[PDB]
Amino acid sequence: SKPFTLPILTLGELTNSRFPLPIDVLYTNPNESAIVQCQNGRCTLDGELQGTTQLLPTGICAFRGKVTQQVQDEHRGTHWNMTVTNLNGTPFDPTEDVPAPLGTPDFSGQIYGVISQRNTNTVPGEGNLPANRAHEAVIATYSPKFTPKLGNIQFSTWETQDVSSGQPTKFTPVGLASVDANSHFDQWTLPSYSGALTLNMNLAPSVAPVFPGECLLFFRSFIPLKGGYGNPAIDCLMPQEWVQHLYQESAPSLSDVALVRYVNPETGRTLFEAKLHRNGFLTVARNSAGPVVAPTNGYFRFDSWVNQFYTLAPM
């Protein structure tokens, strides 16, 4: 077969697969009460992308489409209805066996970013060039108007008027607007991709430890905020570079569980070991929550294929 490998990129050379951020730390939270079932950063060890996962770092939490309607807020701000396409610009076919267009955000929150437009029509007197505009925007993924699987979403602006209808529109994500209670930030709560009364479909499966004393290991990034108090984070199961690597290699999985070692390349010693599961997630034997304190030169190296009964050395 084709032997299994991971990239040799270090922690400071990896990026988050659920938001466009660098990886900051490795992280555990054994007492997590939520089901973990994120939809971006999902890839099996033999290279099958799942959920809404696509390969571009620029596509994570991105949208493309056109604005169709302006609707003022009751109190403050303006909302804009947007039809969405696939990120490559082709029409999104809701019968496609995916939860939503690839790259769609996979958590509840107010996602802050920039909406930009480049008009289709050009002006001969301007050298056959189009008009443009961009503004700060927020997409509330818990909104009843957040229906990307039906091909449409809503975003809000503080801008009151300068958003054009019928013109190509791009959303570049930047961070969150708020993590106040009213902003419903919960990184493990999936949006209702078709609206509140409708079941999500075609999901990548939930992940969990199955061996006693094990917990999930995450690649954690801190996410910027537009305002208010907080130090919010987004935890992914594998960095985007691992998704890209696994997709290209398509190495056969020889068992359900690979043993991997986090190594310090200077010393060559194993700092700790982890189980890398077939569905594309890590567990470790750790009985505590918080960051993993590790040498900056550390990375994961594949050791061998094991099974669910393998006992990891405690962290």
Ligand X SMILES: CC(=O)N[C@H]1[C@@H](O[C@H]2[C@@H](O)[C@@H](CO)O[C@@H](O)[C@@H]2O[C@@H]2O[C@@H](C)[C@@H](O)[C@@H](O)[C@@H]2O)O[C@H](CO)[C@H](O)[C@@H]1O
Residues of this chain that interact with its own copies (CB under 8 A) are 7-9, 12-15, 20-22, 55-59, 87-88, 112, 114, 116, 118, 123, 126-127, 129-134, 136, 170, 172, 174-175, 222, 224-231, 240-241, 244, 248, 296
For ligand X (CB under 6 A), the number of binding residues is: 8
- Among the listed residues 8, 71, 131, 289, the single contact to ligand X using CB under 6 A: 131
Pick the piece of the chain touching ligand X (CB under 6 A) from 42-50, 128-136, 137-145, 258-266: 128-136
227 binds ligand X (CB under 6 A): yes
Distance CA(148)–CA(92), nearest Å, equals 9
Q: Which is nearest to 216 in space by CA: 238, 241, 233?
A: 238
Nearer to its own copies, 7 or 94 (CB): 7
- Among the listed residues 133, 145, 184, 301, the single contact to ligand X using CB under 6 A: 133
Distance CA(307)–CA(58), nearest Å, equals 35
Distance CA(271)–CA(273), nearest Å, equals 7
Nearer to ligand X, 229 or 309 (CB): 229
Nearer to its own copies, 15 or 78 (CB): 15
Nearer to its own copies, 57 or 195 (CB): 57
Nearest approach in angstroms of CB 158 to ligand X is 6
Give the tokens for residue 224: 């910027």
- Among ligand X, its own copies, none, the one that 151 touches (CB under a kind-dependent 5 to 8 A) is none
Backbone angles phi, psi at 49, to 5 degrees: -70, 140
In degrees, rounded to 5, the angle at the alpha carbon of residue 103 between the alpha carbons of residues 172 and 277 is 130
229 binds ligand X (CB under 6 A): yes
- Among its own copies, ligand X, none, the one that 129 touches (CB under a kind-dependent 5 to 8 A) is its own copies
Pick the piece of the chain touching ligand X (CB under 6 A) from 5-13, 67-75, 222-230, 243-251: 222-230
Q: Are strands 168-176 and 63-72 parallel, antiparallel or unpaired?
A: antiparallel
Chain centroid to Cα 288, Å, comes to 25
- Among ligand X, its own copies, none, the one that 174 touches (CB under a kind-dependent 5 to 8 A) is its own copies
Nearest approach in angstroms of CB 77 to ligand X is 9
Nearer to ligand X, 82 or 100 (CB): 82
Backbone angles phi, psi at 70, to 5 degrees: -105, 130
132 binds ligand X (CB under 6 A): yes
In terms of Cβ atoms closer than 10 Å to its own Cβ (0-12, 13-18, 19+), residue 22 is: middle
For residues 67-104, one letter each, b for 16 or more C-beta atoms within 10 angstroms of the residue's C-beta and e for the rest, the string is beeeeeeeeeebbbbbbbbbbeeeebebeeebbbbbbb
| Sheet hosting strand 78-84, strand order edge to edge | 110-118, 168-176, 63-72, 78-84, 152-157
Binding site for ligand X (CB under 6 A): 131-133, 158, 162, 227-229
